[PDB]
Amino acid sequence: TCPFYKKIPGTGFTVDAFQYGVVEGCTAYFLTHFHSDHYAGLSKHFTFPVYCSEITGNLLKNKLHVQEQYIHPLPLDTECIVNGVKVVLLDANHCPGAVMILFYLPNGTVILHTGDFRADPSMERSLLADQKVHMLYLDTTYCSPEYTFPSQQEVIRFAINTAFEAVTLNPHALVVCGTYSIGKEKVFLAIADVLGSKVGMSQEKYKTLQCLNIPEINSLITTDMCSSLVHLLPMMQINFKGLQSHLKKCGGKYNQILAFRPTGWTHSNKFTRIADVIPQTKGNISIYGIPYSEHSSYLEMKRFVQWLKPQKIIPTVNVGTWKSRSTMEKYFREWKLEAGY
Ligand code: NI
Numbered sequence: 001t002c003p004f005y006k007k008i009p010g011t012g013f014t015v016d017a018f019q020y021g022v023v024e025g026c027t028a029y030f031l032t033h034f035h036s037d038h039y040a041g042l043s044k045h046f047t048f049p050v051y052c053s054e055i056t057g058n059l060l061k062n063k064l065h066v067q068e069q070y071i072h073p074l075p076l077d078t079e080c081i082v083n084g085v086k087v088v089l090l091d092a093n094h095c096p097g098a099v100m101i102l103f104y105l106p107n108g109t110v111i112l113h114t115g116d117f118r119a120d121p122s123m124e125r126s127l128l129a130d131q132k133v134h135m136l137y138l139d140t141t142y143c144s145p146e147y148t149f150p151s152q153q154e155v156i157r158f159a160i161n162t163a164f165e166a167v168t169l170n171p172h173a174l175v176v177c178g179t180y181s182i183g184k185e186k187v188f189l190a191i192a193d194v195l196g197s198k199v200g201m202s203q204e205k206y207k208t209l210q211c212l213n214i215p216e217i218n219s220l221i222t223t224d225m226c227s228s229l230v231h232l233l234p235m236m237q238i239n240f241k242g243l244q245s246h247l248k249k250c251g252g253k254y255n256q257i258l259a260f261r262p263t264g265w266t267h268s269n270k271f272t273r274i275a276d277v278i279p280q281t282k283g284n285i286s287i288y289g290i291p292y293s294e295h296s297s298y299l300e301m302k303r304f305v306q307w308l309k310p311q312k313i314i315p316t317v318n319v320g321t322w323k324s325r326s327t328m329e330k331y332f333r334e335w336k337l338e339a340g341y
Contacts, residue, residue: 005137005314008113010105011085015113015137018042027083028072032115033098034059035181046070051082053089055097058211059182077127088127092117094294095183096212102127112308113137114316119296119304128308136310141295141317143328147265148298149291150274156190158274159260159290163191166258167229173256175230176246178238182208183294184262189220191260192230200228226253235261240282247285256284262292302335309341 002020007013012027018041023029031039031052042050044065049072052060057073060066074080076089076099086104094116103111112133167173175195177188192199199221201209206223214220222228233246238261247257268277269291279286296304305313313332318324 003319005316005319008103008111010107010109011103012083013085013103015101016115018046022048030101030113031056031060032101032113033092033095034063035095035116035183038116039064042066051087053097053099055211055213056099058213059097059208062211063208090123090126090128093120093123094118095181096185096214097182102133109134111135111137112310114139116141116294117296118294119300121303123304124307133308134311135314136305136308136312137314137316138301138305139295139317140301140315140328142265142293142298143301143315143318143331145298146270149265149269149293152186152292154274155290155292156186158277159187159288160190160194162288163258164194166256167195170256172254173258174247174250174254176233176238176243176257176259177230178235178259178261179205179232180235182212184292185209185212185214187260187262187290187292188230188232192220192228195229197229198222198224198227199230199232200225201232205232225250238287240285240287243285243287257286259285259287261287261289263289264293264295265291302331305332306335306339309339 002014002017002023006015006017008015012025013030014023014026015030016032016038017023017029018039028049028051031050034056042064046066047070050060050070051072051074054073057071060071061068074089076091080087085106088102089099092098092100092115098115100115100117101113105111110131110133114137116139163175175191188199203223206221209217209221225231238259243257243259247254266289277288279288315328318328
């Protein structure tokens with residue numbers, strides 16, 4: 001049974017609600033982005049209308065085999081009428097294809113559903129500037145002040161400078177980057193660009209990247225691993241054992257691995273600056289954990305909400321414990337008292 005925070009009142013709509021069977025009253029199912037916790041339940045046998053971005057609809061057709069007749073892609077930043085209701089899709093600054101959804105209810109209520117997002121001051125100049133929002137369905141993944149991390153641009157600077165130094169010192173070093181979903185593609189594209197290389201990967205991952213509308217992608221990636229000195233592997237293989245096994249397979253081309261694990265936040269963020277980050281090392285293998293986030297930090301989240309001034313907030317993450325729900329409610333009230341709405 002579908003939980004209340006996935007239903008949009010006064011509509012026939014649900015958001016990210018594919019694992020509940022046939023939801024009573026639902027005439028259109030929205031999907032904010034192609035991450036497994038959100039698409040859970042979709043498959044080639046789904047027979048109701050799915051509304052999403054063009055990039056999400058490419059992934060639905062090629063990776064999940066949803067039939068074409070049920071995929072309804074909408075352009076961004078464009079007023080569209082769905083089943084008699086005005087909607088707008090906005091870029092979420094999450095992974096490729098990820099959107100926020102504005103719903104203009106027939107009674108005059110305006111609802112923003114953020115999906116998963118990394119809030120940014122640029123959103124203060126989208127179509128959100130132009131009218132009031134009554135209800136906010138909010139990605140609260142990092143809603144606590146302990147959750148700090150650097151900008152994406154600082155993290156990519158660190159990765160590029162680290163990889164370029166290592167490979168210039170040792171031209172026989174291989175760089176490996178971990179992945180387990182879409183998102184975070186800048187990590188491996190930025191490193192391969194400084195090295196003058198394509199990124200090498202499995203056929204399965206190449207197929208996924210080919211659905212993302214990245215400019216000039218054919219110039220940037222390949223399935224020919226032998227031609228590439230940046231390799232992608234499953235996140236599970238980014239450990240000393242898995243990396244040793246991979247180095248064996250490269251036929252003595254390489255004598256060292258430098259690997260990256262993009263994570264979200266980790267407790268080593270509560271002590272160490274990005275500049276001071278060091279790897280774990282065993283022999284000729286070194287592994288960096290880098291804090292590349294596609295979700296709002298606490299401060300980014302608080303700025304967005306204090307600018308938007310919603311009348312009511314419904315969290316969509318960390319909703320399963322009383323302690324989490326009470327913590328989030330306290331911060332929402334602080335923010336409103338501080339800003340005066
Ligand atoms: Ni996500």
